[PDB]
Scaffold this active site. Structure first.
Site, mmCIF file in Angstrom:
data_model
loop_
_atom_site.group_PDB
_atom_site.id
_atom_site.type_symbol
_atom_site.label_atom_id
_atom_site.label_comp_id
_atom_site.label_asym_id
_atom_site.label_seq_id
_atom_site.Cartn_x
_atom_site.Cartn_y
_atom_site.Cartn_z
ATOM 1 N N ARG C 150 -16.342 6.397 -37.167
ATOM 2 C CA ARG C 150 -15.839 5.018 -36.786
ATOM 3 C C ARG C 150 -14.751 4.699 -37.780
ATOM 4 N NH1 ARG C 150 -19.276 5.721 -32.271
ATOM 5 N NH2 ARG C 150 -19.057 3.735 -30.982
ATOM 6 N N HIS C 326 -18.286 25.251 -19.775
ATOM 7 C CA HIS C 326 -18.333 23.953 -18.667
ATOM 8 C C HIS C 326 -18.435 24.487 -17.287
ATOM 9 C CE1 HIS C 326 -17.056 21.983 -22.696
ATOM 10 N NE2 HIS C 326 -17.933 21.165 -22.308
ATOM 11 N N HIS C 355 -25.659 20.898 -8.137
ATOM 12 C CA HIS C 355 -24.630 19.982 -8.076
ATOM 13 C C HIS C 355 -23.261 20.598 -7.744
ATOM 14 C CE1 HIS C 355 -23.106 16.116 -9.746
ATOM 15 N NE2 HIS C 355 -22.180 16.816 -10.296
ATOM 16 N N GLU C 356 -22.909 21.688 -8.533
ATOM 17 C CA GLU C 356 -21.534 22.245 -8.233
ATOM 18 C C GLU C 356 -21.372 22.809 -6.738
ATOM 19 O OE1 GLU C 356 -19.035 22.320 -10.293
ATOM 20 O OE2 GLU C 356 -20.223 21.206 -12.065
ATOM 21 N N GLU C 383 -18.630 13.026 -7.173
ATOM 22 C CA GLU C 383 -19.755 13.381 -8.257
ATOM 23 C C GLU C 383 -20.957 12.796 -7.389
ATOM 24 O OE1 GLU C 383 -19.700 14.444 -11.240
ATOM 25 O OE2 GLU C 383 -17.357 14.585 -11.413
ATOM 26 N N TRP C 458 -15.340 -7.390 -28.990
ATOM 27 C CA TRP C 458 -16.182 -6.344 -28.353
ATOM 28 C C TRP C 458 -17.501 -6.187 -28.901
ATOM 29 C CZ3 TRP C 458 -17.468 -0.651 -29.872
ATOM 30 C CH2 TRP C 458 -17.748 0.101 -28.879
ATOM 31 N N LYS C 462 -20.998 -6.369 -26.700
ATOM 32 C CA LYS C 462 -22.318 -5.377 -26.958
ATOM 33 C C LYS C 462 -23.402 -6.101 -27.100
ATOM 34 C CE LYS C 462 -20.879 -1.266 -28.672
ATOM 35 N NZ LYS C 462 -21.255 -0.259 -27.675
ATOM 36 N N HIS C 486 -13.155 9.700 -23.635
ATOM 37 C CA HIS C 486 -12.679 9.199 -22.366
ATOM 38 C C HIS C 486 -11.456 8.298 -22.589
ATOM 39 C CE1 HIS C 486 -16.646 10.467 -21.014
ATOM 40 N NE2 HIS C 486 -16.196 11.026 -19.935
ATOM 41 N N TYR C 496 -18.271 6.701 -13.364
ATOM 42 C CA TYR C 496 -19.831 6.844 -13.705
ATOM 43 C C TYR C 496 -20.834 5.677 -13.136
ATOM 44 C CZ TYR C 496 -17.512 10.140 -16.704
ATOM 45 O OH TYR C 496 -16.862 11.071 -17.156
#
Ligand SMILES: *[C@@H]1O[C@H](CO)[C@@H](O[C@@H]2O[C@H](CO)[C@@H](O[C@@H]3O[C@H](CO)[C@@H](O)[C@H](O)[C@@H]3O)[C@H](O)[C@H]2NC(C)=O)[C@H](O)[C@H]1NC(C)=O
Ligand SMILES: *[C@@H]1O[C@H](CO)[C@@H](O[C@@H]2O[C@H](CO)[C@@H](O[C@@H]3O[C@H](CO)[C@@H](O)[C@H](O)[C@@H]3O)[C@H](O)[C@H]2NC(C)=O)[C@H](O)[C@H]1NC(C)=O
Ligand SMILES: *[C@@H]1O[C@H](CO)[C@@H](O[C@@H]2O[C@H](CO)[C@@H](O)[C@H](O)[C@H]2NC(C)=O)[C@H](O)[C@H]1NC(C)=O
Ligand SMILES: *[C@@H]1O[C@H](CO)[C@@H](O[C@@H]2O[C@H](CO)[C@@H](O)[C@H](O)[C@H]2NC(C)=O)[C@H](O)[C@H]1NC(C)=O
Lengths: 99, 593, 593
Positions: C150, C326, C355-356, C383, C458, C462, C486, C496
């Site tokens: 961090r 991957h 899944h693929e 997805e 933030w 949280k 990301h 997601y």
């Protein structure tokens, strides 16, 4: 006790009968076989009453359909007996034999 | 898609609704013809089931959004279905409003005014007070009856009206209306193709515009009636003043028809009454309806159904079943059309039979339409279509044609003038009262009139519009409008005004269609099939189309016009102008004896 | 006419584009399978030519005006073509933004945190720090790893983020968007027929609405996890407090799946793992894909192409070419569908293969559509379609049916409960983190959060949303979000959350289609052709139609619904409610040890 089909997915073909009581699905959501909003049972009742107007009184309809096929035709109209005259010169038609 | 879903929903609804509505209508007919406790309870269950089904469908119908529906007929049907009415409010508020309405109805039904210094002589309005208003000539007795009924009803009903207005305002706001007056004015709203759009706000201005044209004829009629009443009452009526409220021949002044013996133009000339001719020729109710049917077929409308002859009652039964005196036309549904009238062999009943048959014909024409659209274009149209037939039936040409009136009969000007004056007293006189009462109700619902100044406004308007003055000053503890039946029982009153305009407009349009070349009042539409077709085009439509389109279909105009009304009364208007030259036409607002 | 010109332009574009896109995709595949400098340079030229052609066509496409185009498919294709993206800015600004992105990617890739007092032990995130987060139970070591990564990442990346936000805001404003957050929210925008319209602004409220329903289940899960961690850590976690940031089993707390040994409901009961059964029966990757193909044909989706079997790699090559570990599904174009996965014979790889293959089936279905519309309806859908197959593949019924699991296997409640808890830790746990991170990014891009108060906002959120407290106080010099992969590499994170909602909604819709009568988690969609057709209707569409229409096509709803998510986790939710009765459910915002 007199019923009619108000809702069907497609039009009937000639001389076709549908006895299905399946709930008519007019909406995207599945009916699931239980009546629900936008899901209507197809068969509606003709609630006949004696005091209805002439347009709505019950009428019995018989439809006669005649078909000819390559097989010999065995349904024909009545045959006239007429009468029998003897000892004179008369044109005779006996079972399709003429003279 | 939403439109297809609405179409299937309406298709399911029409089949279920028609059967339930027929059951409710049949139970109501069975109670009306054969009054008893069991028929009443059966009617109660039938109405309860029909109302419950209608509300359940209305709640489902509200889910649909009208924005994505393009076809006008489906949108109009959904609009008719989606009107919750009184169900919008919560149960506590709805129950309170229903309790107030029921107590108002019972108290009005049981209203009692009793003679001072004569305790035994206590009078109800329905058996005897109305008779006193119609027939009595004594000033003091009329003053007593008017003041006593006004005092008892106003003092009892003023708080009830005070919360009634608030509850109705809450219900209207709950239904996305500005006020209860807007909710009533919604009935005339038409949404349609361009140039046929009608708005609730427009109606008030249209009524005022019609009223201004009507006002000179009313002023001349008021002056003539005032002079005749002055002849009847020498010192109690002023020449320049308004008429007293209790001298108008009615309890509320709604109809001036009872002033005809006092205000007759020519006493010597007999009326056009043909009751004696019917008595001599042995006519009966069946013949009266058959003659009405003959008129309808002759004009080109369809014949009456076999069911109508078989099931209707046209005579008092006299077999021990109680009946309702009032003539009513019933559209039970599924092609069942009936008339309940206890018809006596009189001219008035003959005209009434024509009016009710006109109602039945109007109901029959739109039977093809879907169930939600089997109604009149608006409230006025349904009454107007019967009224035009009543107008046509009463003409001397029609009576001569069917042999009621002799072939050699001479129609002088004087009989036309007195008949027109009687028609004006029944028809023209009601219009200022109707406009003033509706305007008062609309302003009270709007809140334009302050709560504590209600009475002070109403008399002023009666002084301004009706030209009728109060006999005695009334403070705000009184509720003077509430004495009328329609306001105490939550009924719209503007329908009579619209009916009056539509009736003359329809009559002129049919007479022009029939190529009549004479005065409008003498016109008969018999044996004019083209006129019947022209009328039938409107009759078939029902409320499927906007009422403006139907009005254009009959008269060629899209709005209310009172030029036919003036045209009907033009000889009478000329006569009234001729005889009012010495007198002063008009009234003064300040109270004059 | 403009519409015809657009149609001809699109027709020319599709033929040129498909060939260039196939060349770019083939070069990218050739690099991915056979990593080398020459394949990389070939990929670079192919991508450069494809990008240059795409920009040149986009510049020509922008000349067309969308106002006079009526047909939705042409308008949608032109909308997809007209998205300039990063090209809107000037060359200097674009170069600066690209430089910032490249330096961010390299610095994240090369991120280094090293042991204090032990200089030789310097650790990268990808080989070892993630292992420490997944496996280590020591509080101090986790605190060191979290704080050190961090500190290093936040101090280096705080200025880079500060100008990154400004450049992204300029690019979004240049593209007629309010902020970069609106630009990301544009992906869910649907323009279509009435009632299918979706707006960017709507998405935030929809996410919040879904979140509120999800919040009780998350609160119960958080309380249970907190109690289990308290058992693991005796004095470092408070009963009423939030969880520490470094004890969540991940570097950022994104997935709670690594807490499963600590938080297992029933330690004694084994997992449903079938790897040993695959080992005993000599299964291989070819068999795994064949079984997946058998499932897809059984549900009624089409068979795999011959090209898919011939060209794909399903095993490590072991011939000296470097590969990417991957698993990725490639739609090269022109009917070429491939899967790159280094498949080991495990249960997890078997689910990954399902899944693929689901991704490949999704790509295959919309091949009929034009080139610009050969995509998912939105980012979540692509997805989600793979995830539903992964859900169906893992059920005990499916494993028994294909012989992986013995016929006599008994499914007790305890295995269902622990499996559901593991699924919740992977799936339910990620949702507050995803919502909070996306909300923070959207507000930062909007400017709702002040520039100098970023960190202070933030942690509060949280504390408010995730219910996770910082171990050590952080001032504004830190850039704590930027440590995530990301955000540092300019990737949208809301996909997601949408994927999670869509996956359960699709699963419930297919199970209702398949007439399954049991619990949702045990449902298998095998041998249900009607469900396959119901799914395939959405799959064929691609993004030709609005995503709301596709969602209605599968589930009958036009918006995100979390009732399927609650329905999936209902036995677990009941169990969590049963065991949390003594404990306090919820967290306190203030920092508690
Ligand atoms: C509408 O049309 C009908 C039929 O055209 C008219 O009825 C007809 O009326 C005339 C005159 O009243 C009748 O003429 C006379 O009838 C008597 C009695 O039968 C007869 O003795 C005379 O020699 C002469 O024929 C005529 O018969 C009668 N027709 C029918 C079929 O009833 C009716 O008057 C018309 N109405 C109007 C308003 O024009
Ligand atoms: C979906 O449908 C297929 C085909 O109907 C199902 O495969 C079938 O599964 C049953 C039971 O597992 C098999 O029955 C038994 O198979 C064993 C091994 O061959 C045999 O020794 C027994 O005597 C009995 O036949 C059946 O053979 C098998 N059929 C095929 C073609 O594979 C599958 O189980 C279904 N899946 C679901 C989830 O319903
Ligand atoms: C008027 O109504 C009464 C009851 O509402 C009718 O009397 C019923 O007649 C039916 C058939 O004759 C019987 O089955 C019922 O038991 C009778 N009820 C009673 C209470 O007597 C009567 O017939 C009706 N009259 C007319 C003319 O319709
Ligand atoms: C992996 O890539 C290398 C180079 O990209 C391939 O080697 C090439 O093979 C072709 C065909 O035989 C030759 O024409 C080239 O000259 C070769 N390049 C070099 C640098 O030697 C290799 O064949 C690829 N392997 C696989 C399995 O595709």
């Amino acid at each position: 006790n007199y019923l009619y089909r108000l809702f069907r997915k497609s039009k009937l073909k000639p001389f076709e009968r549908d006895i299905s009581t399946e709930i008519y699905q007019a909406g995207n959501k599945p009916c699931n076989g239980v009546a629900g909003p936008n899901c209507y049972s197809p068969l509606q009742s003709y609630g006949f009453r004696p005091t209805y107007g002439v347009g709505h009184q019950p009428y019995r309809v018989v439809v006669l359909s005649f078909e000819l096929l390559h097989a010999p035709a065995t349904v024909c109209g009545p045959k006239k007996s007429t009468n029998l005259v003897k000892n004179k010169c008369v044109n005779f038609n006996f079972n399709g034999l003429t003279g | 898609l939403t439109e297809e879903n609405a179409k299937t929903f309406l298709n399911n609804f029409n089949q279920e609704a028609e059967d339930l509505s027929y059951q409710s209508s049949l139970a109501s007919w069975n109670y009306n013809t054969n009054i008893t406790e069991e028929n009443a309870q059966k009617m109660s269950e039938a109405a309860a089931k029909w109302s419950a089904f209608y509300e359940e469908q209305s709640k489902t119908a509200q889910s649909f959004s009208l924005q994505e529906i393009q076809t006008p007929i489906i949108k109009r049907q959904l609009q008719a279905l989606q009107q919750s009415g009184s169900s919008a409010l919560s149960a506590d508020k709805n129950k309170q409003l229903n309790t107030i309405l029921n107590t108002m109805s019972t108290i009005y039904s049981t209203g009692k005014v009793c003679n001072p210094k004569n305790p035994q002589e206590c009078l109800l309005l329905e058996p005897g007070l109305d008779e006193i208003m119609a027939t009595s000539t004594d000033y003091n007795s009329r003053l007593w009856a008017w003041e006593g009924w006004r005092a008892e009803v106003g003092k009892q009903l003023r708080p009830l009206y005070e919360e009634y207005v608030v509850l109705k305002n809450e219900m209207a706001r709950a239904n996305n209306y500005n006020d209860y007056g807007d909710y009533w004015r919604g009935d005339y709203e038409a949404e349609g193709a361009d140039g046929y759009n009608y708005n609730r706000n427009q109606l008030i201005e249209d009524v005022e515009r019609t009223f201004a044209e009507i006002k000179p004829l009313y002023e001349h009629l008021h002056a003539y009636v005032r002079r005749k009443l002055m002849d009847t009452y020498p010192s109690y009526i002023s020449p320049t003043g308004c008429l007293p409220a209790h001298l108008l021949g009615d309890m509320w002044g709604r109809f001036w028809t009872n002033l005809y013996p006092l205000t007759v133009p020519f006493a010597q000339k007999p009326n056009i009454d043909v009751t004696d001719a019917m008595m001599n020729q042995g006519w009966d109710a069946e013949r009266i309806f058959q003659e009405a049917e003959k008129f309808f077929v002759s004009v080109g409308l369809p014949h009456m159904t076999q069911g109508f002859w078989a099931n209707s009652m046209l005579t008092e039964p006299a077999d021990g079943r109680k009946v309702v005196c009032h003539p009513t036309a019933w559209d039970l549904g599924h092609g069942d059309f009936r008339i309940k009238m206890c018809t006596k062999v009189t001219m008035d009943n003959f005209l009434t039979a024509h009016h009710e048959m006109g109602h039945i014909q109007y109901d029959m024409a739109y039977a093809r339409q879907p169930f939600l659209l089997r109604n009149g274009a608006n409230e006025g149209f349904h009454e107007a279509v019967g009224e035009i037939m009543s107008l046509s039936a009463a003409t001397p040409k029609h009576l001569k044609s069917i042999g009621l009136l002799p072939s050699d009969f001479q129609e002088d000007s004087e009989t036309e003038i007195n008949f027109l004056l009687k028609q004006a007293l029944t028809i023209v006189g009601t219009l200022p009262f109707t406009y003033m009462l509706e305007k008062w109700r609309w302003m009270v619902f709007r809140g334009e009139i302050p709560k504590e100044q209600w009475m002070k406004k109403w008399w002023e308007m009666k002084r301004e519009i009706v030209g009728v003055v109060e006999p005695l000053p009334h403070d705000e503890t009184y509720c003077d409008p509430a004495s009328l039946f329609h306001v105490s029982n939550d009924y719209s009153f503007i329908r009579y005004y619209t009916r009056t305009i539509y009736q003359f407009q329809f009559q002129e349009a049919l007479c022009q269609a029939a190529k009549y070349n004479g005065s409008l009042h003498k016109c008969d539409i018999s044996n004019s099939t083209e006129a019947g077709q022209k009328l039938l085009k409107m009759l078939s439509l029902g409320n499927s189309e906007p009422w403006t389109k139907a009005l254009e279909n009959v008269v060629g105009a899209r709005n209310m016009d009172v030029k036919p009304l003036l045209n009907y009364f033009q000889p009478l208007f000329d006569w009234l102008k001729e005889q009012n030259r010495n007198s002063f036409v008009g009234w003064n607002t300040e109270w004059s004896p």
